[PDB]
């Protein structure tokens, strides 16, 4: 995900530049070129943490007819009515003494603790009490569900559930009536490229490529996710990951600003400082080098690197574009000078190699 190094797989011609035309690279937007207008906005997200089974409780309303004639009781069944059932429910809940009860009487019994599990994708409800274990949901046309007895209905004791969201603040990235993505509250850029429309707990939103769900008004037409699609929880570990990445990118951006400013005030363009101008994220950027005291740039598209051996296969080889890149004197772009013995030296790789130290050929061998 987060590379150990970035080398350009595409590179243009070296043009001589003046130091005033140097700039520290943008490491925020990831491969959504042209989308650079940032507008601070708000967006919805899944609440942070684990989301247990969303329970909503209801009540089963069954209808009987009791005939008493001169201590003999006949008992018949009939299918009830929603509003009457809820009136009986208010009776039994508020403690109204009017619910306890050749004369016949119609009674409506209401067994209260009938819990159901609510699907967040579609607001369907799940309990063994429905036909097939599932009801379509409680819309406003259908204020009740059916049971397998088909003479007893189920109604919710509706008062909060689907309280699985939060309102976060971020930055919308665009370039004119097209939003490519957004910086989220953690500070990491997420791309809308390839997302699909997902309606979660009745809230219209989008599922990104990485499986995260957000809710934002997109000025574009996107197709719906298939009925099979799922979204990822907003677990604390995802926030940890984003915090680590953003921490690093901020740190290295400040270090690059200190380097660029230390170049302006001195006009001393070394190779150590030039490495701080490298683009740390896959995408289009710039590459720099120094030929015969002259300071030049080139357009480039940086590709994420996974291992150090990928770009150094042999003695003085810097694999760029499939073949080893040429060196003038002993330097390449972004300060990858050839080493003391014509090997390739990358500043980041040297730092990486050092922290692995203590490991090989302790060589505390002693003479005779």
């Amino acid at each position, epitope marked *: 995900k987060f590379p150990i190094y970035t080398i350009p797989d595409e590179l243009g011609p070296w043009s001589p530049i003046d130091i005033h035309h140097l700039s520290c690279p943008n490491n925020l937007v990831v491969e959504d070129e042209g989308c650079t207008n940032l507008s601070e906005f708000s967006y919805m997200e899944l609440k942070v943490g684990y989301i247990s089974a969303i329970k909503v409780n209801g009540f089963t309303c069954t209808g009987v007819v009791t005939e008493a004639e001169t201590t003999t009781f006949k008992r018949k069944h009939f299918r009830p009515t929603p509003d009457a059932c809820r009136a009986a429910y208010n009776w039994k809940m508020a403690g109204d003494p009017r619910y306890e009860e050749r004369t016949t009487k119609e009674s409506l019994i209401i067994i209260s603790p009938s819990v159901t599990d609510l699907d967040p994708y579609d607001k369907s409800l799940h309990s063994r009490v429905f036909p097939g274990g599932k009801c379509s949901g409680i819309t406003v046309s259908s204020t009740y569900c059916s049971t397998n007895h088909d003479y007893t209905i189920w109604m919710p004791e509706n008062p909060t559930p689907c309280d699985i969201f939060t309102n976060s603040r971020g930055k919308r990235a665009s370039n004119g009536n097209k939003t490519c993505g957004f910086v989220d509250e953690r500070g990491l850029y997420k791309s809308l490229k390839g997302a699909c429309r997902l309606k979660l707990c009745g809230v219209l939103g989008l599922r990104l490529m990485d499986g995260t769900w957000v809710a934002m008004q997109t000025s574009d037409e996107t197709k719906w996710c298939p009925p099979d699609q799922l979204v990822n929880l907003h677990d604390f570990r995802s926030d940890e990951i984003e915090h680590l990445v953003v921490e690093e990118l901020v740190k290295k951006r400040e270090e690059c600003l200190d380097a660029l400013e230390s170049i302006m005030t001195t006009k001393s363009v070394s190779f150590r400082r030039l490495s701080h101008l490298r683009k740390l994220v896959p995408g289009f950027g710039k590459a720099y080098t120094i030929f015969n005291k002259t300071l030049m740039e080139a357009d480039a598209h940086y590709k994420s690197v996974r291992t*150090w051996n990928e770009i150094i*296969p*042999s003695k003085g*080889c810097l*694999k760029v574009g*499939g073949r080893c890149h040429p060196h003038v004197n002993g330097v390449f772009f972004n300060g990858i000078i050839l080493g003391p013995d014509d090997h390739v030296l990358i500043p980041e790789m040297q730092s990486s190699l050092l922290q692995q130290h203590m490991e*090989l050929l302790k060589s505390s061998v002693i003479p005779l």
Partner: single-chain antibody
Amino acid sequence: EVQLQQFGAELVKPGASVKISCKASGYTFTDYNMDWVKQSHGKSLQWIGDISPYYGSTGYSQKFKGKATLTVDRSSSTAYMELRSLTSEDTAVYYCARRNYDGSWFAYWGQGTLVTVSELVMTQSPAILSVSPGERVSFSCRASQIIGTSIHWYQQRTNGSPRLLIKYASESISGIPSRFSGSGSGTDFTLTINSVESDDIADYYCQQSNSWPVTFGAGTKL
């Protein structure tokens, strides 16, 4: 020249380890990286990882992280790989390989060590080929995405090391007969051999070098 000496075989026990050796000579041991590949009985070649004898940097495919460990000894010019917690699924032939000067295609292979225990996918078509000698034949290798012309064709006779026949889908190799040729454009590559002969019945693998990690085709048998 150049030789990559390997030892014959090791018979190991489930759950134990073994350390395979690869002594390189003919070139400077530190001037090139060292790769390692696994080949099960009647299977294709699978890249395990590589090591730089100078820096000591290692690269591993996710399948072998924790299973294989790469080391070197620069005084003796010998690379070692250790396999611990062996299961029956680890019984295979383990080759050590040496790539080109730009690390695109495999230049040299070792004898191989059969250890006995008791990404871009390359869709290679067909698995088996049954035709008579003297005919002209051509099999296909198709990549999961665009790879330009970054693919190489290897021939492997029985109990032998793979031998590179074509580099970059069309370029010939000096010392190898003129019967082999390729046609590469985009995703679909075809290796054609005219005038099939007796020593040309073997397994043929295609290998891409466009993206990391390195992957091979399933293989085509004659």
